[PDB]
Ligand SMILES: COC(=O)[C@H](Cc1ccc(OC(=O)C#Cc2ccc(OC)cc2O)cc1)Nc1ccccc1C(=O)c1ccccc1
């Protein structure tokens with residue numbers, strides 16, 4: 001029965017809204033230009049320096065540190081959302097930890113896309129907007145850390161997915177049977193089918209004109225995995241290059257593999 | 258008319274049954290007996306045996322925390338069922354659910370509980386009251402306070418149907434801190450109180466002022482929740498998983 005699938009989608013969207021402070025719609029409104037929400041934009045060091053006045057060590061490191069603290073915030077929100085997903089809590093604790101560890105970074109990048117536009121990415125709760133170039137400008141090796149994300153962001157954004165569509169999609173990502181170190185795959189696999197079934201109906205209903213959106217969206221997953229692998233490689237260089245720099249413990253634990 | 262209250266009462270009962278895997282009647286049948294006896298842990302060995310059938314002090318508490326998380330999701334599904342809960346401001350729904358859950362968990366917990374022991378693993382196993390009491394502080398005290406409440410609360414002899422309305426009343430609480438709008442929450446709560454009152458009289462005509470007595474309990478729930486959090490802070494003083502339970 002579709003109603004069951006529709007109801008499940010409704011639940012996920014509801015959980016998605018409560019779980020995440022900044023929705024895609026809110027981000028789009030600030031970016032679209034729909035006065036109250038207008039974002040201070042950092043395109044230069046002085047603007048970044050200025051940003052402190054109205055927005056919440058080394059600048060390249062400080063900015064990289066900002067993401068690490070923010071990622072921690074995302075992990076907490078994703079983790080909160082993940083519990084919402086029907087039957088995720090029920091799964092074996094190790095599997096819950098394993099799914100979240102592998103799943104979280106992919107979701108963050110997907111979720112990040114909502115903030116991003118070819119020019120820049122929203123920061124500090126949408127209070128400020130950071131230019132893509134400025135992040136690109138960052139001194140090696142830290143400069144091309146958001147360059148991969150931006151590309152995924154235009155390509156993925158192209159989809160034009162609404163928050164409701166995303167909430168189911170993030171759910172599918174988290175509940176992935178094919179995760180290294182899983183004790184039970186079958187319980188996870190069954191849940192994903194429901195998410196997959198719900199997502200498929202949701203896209204058709206939501207984006208009737210769009211064709212093979214489900215297939216196109218599912219393809220996106222390969223890109224997310226590629227991005228995560230690239231980031232880990234980049235992270236490895238950062239640690240050796242910067243002995244002094246410190247990584248968040250929660251973030252480090254996810255990193256270990 | 259009155260039919261609406263009865264309609265509401267049945268609707269909550271159906272939602273309550275669907276929402277929760279294990280019911281007081283189902284729990285009752287196992288403690289009373291009626292079809293395989295739950296594995297019983299009275300000893301450290303039995304608990305070790307218990308894991309396979311289905312450190313010492315710390316691990317058990319985690320299971321309760323793990324179970325609680327399951328309860329919150331189950332409660333959330335049932336909470337949605339309640340008429341007009343979904344319509345409420347999303348911040349309010351989160352606030353009612355957040356503050357509401359602990360009181361409901363203990364109330365739900367009570368149905369499983371008997372003076373001697375509390376059921377676990379969906380009635381698969383029974384943990385002896387004495388064994389829980391034995392556990393090294395702060396853990397030894399932790400369960401016992403719940404047992405005392407359960408015995409007194411169980412005294413009412415409420416049926417699952419009575420609980421379902423009662424559970425809705427707890428969730429729909431105006432007092433909760435940070436509510437943006439309370440007119441809708443109190444107005445819905447008022448209707449549920451009306452439904453609960455009618456349900457008790459019909460379901461328990463012989464009982465006198467059962468409604469008032471049930472309303473009285475809430476004070477018990479608030480103190481128990483107050484106690485559990487206070488003990489919990491003390492527990493703190495001794496990875497990703499933290500995030501889950503939080
Ligand atoms: C270690 O954690 C990570 O994997 C993160 C992934 C990530 C990427 C984006 C993200 O969300 C955000 O986009 C954000 C944010 C943010 C928040 C608060 C803030 O004020 C202090 C400032 C901010 O820019 C959240 C997480 N990436 C980084 C981690 C550390 C340092 C830099 C990054 C970058 O992604 C990065 C980035 C701009 C150049 C170069 C690199």
Ligand SMILES: COc1ccc2ccc(=O)oc2c1
Pocket residue numbers: 317319320321322324366376377378379
């Ligand atoms: C999963 O097994 C458990 C372990 C611990 C508890 C503790 C409280 C409870 O109500 O139910 C439980 C169930």
